[PDB]
Design a binder for these strands. Structure first.
Ligand SMILES: CC(C)N(CCCNC(=O)Nc1ccc(C(C)(C)C)cc1)C[C@H]1O[C@@H](n2cc(Br)c3c(N)ncnc32)[C@H](O)[C@@H]1O
Ligand SMILES: [K+]
Ligand SMILES: [K+]
Length: 552
DNA sequence: TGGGACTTTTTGA
DNA sequence: TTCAAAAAGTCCCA
């Protein structure tokens, strides 16, 4: 790694100032002149140095009141520095050099005496035996997903942090849990993390832990905005407390324009109160396992559709992920590749990518998949294995199932069942800016970037493929799905079965007209001299029908 | 260097 | 035996 020295992970100063102010704005320094403020991912001290400055001003502005109320010899301006570093600032980080630099910076904040002990711990914050809780906790924890996390460390997290970390969870789930655990009664925590846990299936346990253990004061959701320059992550700020209150309401600040520069205003509060953000309140007591954080109009819209629709896609359809070859370059070839003359056409499948999926129809495929699982003997079709697949034999053997012997070196890692793909079905891209559900007539295969489903036999008399793609591609359903969809990056939502199959659908008197409009759209889209203007008009008419059906 | 087009296979269950 | 989730995405260009 050692990319931390570049500065891409440095938290923007406006974010840091907001989080520190959020935690310390209303601290009664007279009542408690010994607040413990902690950052368990302090790094070089982006947060902790600002904490020092805020504390110094807070002590200096009340120095005489402190001198009068308490030991008058102890409370002096010249003593403020020492008192802060002795009793107030706490930092933990696993990088020794970061701790050393932070110690030097904190010591140089004053610039002889005997010695000042700075409470900086070089350790694994997730393993440290914390000997006391803290008044305030701030910072930016590390984010590490299931692929990039070390195996032994992952075993430790699975054993010890099972309440929030399991399956495809992230390391910052555990940091959330640790922060909550060591926060004092009545304390306040404020952190910047990825936003994905708000909606992701992996974050269900983490959402339950937060909801049941702290009061969430505020969620700032930047959606797909690029808060961290040259980092592909979407960020949010969470502020929570352990204060005894009867109010269970959350301030949600949801950005409206993802193309804004965060330095537009001198402070984050100006941006939050501006027209660039929307604000609304969510009753924490009404949160289910999912957190539906939308304004009143969207909530009314969502509840109307949920109540009106008696079926869901999961009820009526069978869903599946695409082929996972485990090495696409060894099995995927251009349809015009001369090497395909070496492969019998019985082994060749049409192969599409997510970009080949439009609304209602799939682009003509330009790639072929060698379904190598049907190769019986290694001696037969030896040219295919020697001249096409074997070119990547080493990387093929590094696959998990090849090393365990479950798969031959030339087989597909996850070849699924051919019969699921070789039928009329609906396909949609796994990540997209809008609903794009297409009817596949061409027995197209795909990788995991395209998901498929087909209608169950018992529901074929009630739902047709043409009707489903009509309502699923409508503006109503685009908005409806995005209400709870998992926002990933700028103009990209996840379209994964764990949320797509929860989409609810309806049947009523408009079924025939909606289906007919969808058929007209498909017929136009499949023409030779295509002009989509009529398609847009038909789509507008269909959207009007769907809005009439759902009463919105 | 910042923004847009596009998306693999490793992995736990 | 074999499913599906996971962006500190990845990569290119003006
Ligand atoms: C990095 C980021 C994604 N993350 C936050 C931004 C840190 N900010 C910063 O400014 N870091 C930094 C910068 C420069 C250096 C030098 C000395 C090499 C120049 C060191 C740290 C990760 C930070 O959290 C620390 N970390 C990682 C783990 Br994993 C961990 C842990 N288990 N316990 C405690 N601290 C931990 C990590 O040590 C890390 O600090
Ligand atoms: K006194
Ligand atoms: K982003």
């Amino acid at each position: 790694d050692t990319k931390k020295a570049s500065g891409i992970y440095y938290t923007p100063k406006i974010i840091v100032d907001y989080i520190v102010k959020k935690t310390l704005k209303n601290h009664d320094i007279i009542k408690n002149p010994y607040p413990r403020i902690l950052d368990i991912s302090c790094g070089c001290g982006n947060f902790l140095l600002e904490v020092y400055d805020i504390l110094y001003d807070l002590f200096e502005e009340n120095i005489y009141e402190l001198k009068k109320k308490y030991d008058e010899n102890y409370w002096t301006v010249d003593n403020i520095h020492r008192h802060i570093l002795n009793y107030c600032i706490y930092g933990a980080d696993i990088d020794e050099k970061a701790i050393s630099i932070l110690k030097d910076s904190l010591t140089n904040k004053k610039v002889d005496e005997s010695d000042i002990k700075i409470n900086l711990f070089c350790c694994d914050s997730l393993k440290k035996k914390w000997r006391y809780k803290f008044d305030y906790i701030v910072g930016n924890p590390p984010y590490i997903g299931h692929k990039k996390l070390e195996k032994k460390y992952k075993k430790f997290l699975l054993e010890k942090y099972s309440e929030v970390y399991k399956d495809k969870a992230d390391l910052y789930f555990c940091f959330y849990k640790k922060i909550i655990d060591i926060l004092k009664q009545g304390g306040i925590g404020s952190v910047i993390t990825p936003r994905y846990f708000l909606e992701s299936l992996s974050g269900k346990d983490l959402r339950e832990y937060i909801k049941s253990n702290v009061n969430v004061q505020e969620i700032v959701d930047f959606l797909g905005a690029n808060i961290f320059k040259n980092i592909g992550v979407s960020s949010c700020i969470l502020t929570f407390d352990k204060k005894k209150t009867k109010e269970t309401y959350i301030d949600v600040f949801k950005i409206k324009n993802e193309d804004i520069c965060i330095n537009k205003f001198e402070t984050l509060e100006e941006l939050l109160k501006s027209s660039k953000f929307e604000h609304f309140n969510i009753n924490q007591r009404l949160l289910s396992d999912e957190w539906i954080l939308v304004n009143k109009d969207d909530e009314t819209f969502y509840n109307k559709i949920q109540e009106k629709c008696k079926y869901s896609l999961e009820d009526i359809a069978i869903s599946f992920q695409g082929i996972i070859t485990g090495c696409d370059k060894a099995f995927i070839l251009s349809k015009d590749d001369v090497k395909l003359n070496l492969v019998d056409d019985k082994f060749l499948k049409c192969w599409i990518k997510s970009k080949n999926i439009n609304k209602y129809i799939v682009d003509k495929s330009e790639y072929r998949l060698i379904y190598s699982n049907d190769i019986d003997n290694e001696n037969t079709n030896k040219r295919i294995l020697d001249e096409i697949i074997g070119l990547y034999k080493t990387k093929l053997e590094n696959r998990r199932e090849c090393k365990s012997g479950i798969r031959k070196w030339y087989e597909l890692q996850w070849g699924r069942e051919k019969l699921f793909f070789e039928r009329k079905k609906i396909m949609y891209p796994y990540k997209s800016n809008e609903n794009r559900f297409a009817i596949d007539y061409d027995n197209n295969f795909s990788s995991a970037d395209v998901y498929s489903f087909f209608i169950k036999e018992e529901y074929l008399d009630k739902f047709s493929y043409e009707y489903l793609v009509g309502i699923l591609n409508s503006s109503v359903y685009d908005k409806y799905f995005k209400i709870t969809a998992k926002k990933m990056s700028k103009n990209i939502y996840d379209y994964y079965p764990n949320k797509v199959m929860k989409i609810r659908i309806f049947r009523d008197n408009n079924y025939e007209e909606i289906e007919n409009l969808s058929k007209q759209i498909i017929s136009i889209l499949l023409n030779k001299s295509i002009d989509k203007g009529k398609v847009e008009k038909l789509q507008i008419k269909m959207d009007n029908l769907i809005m009439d059906s759902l009463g919105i």
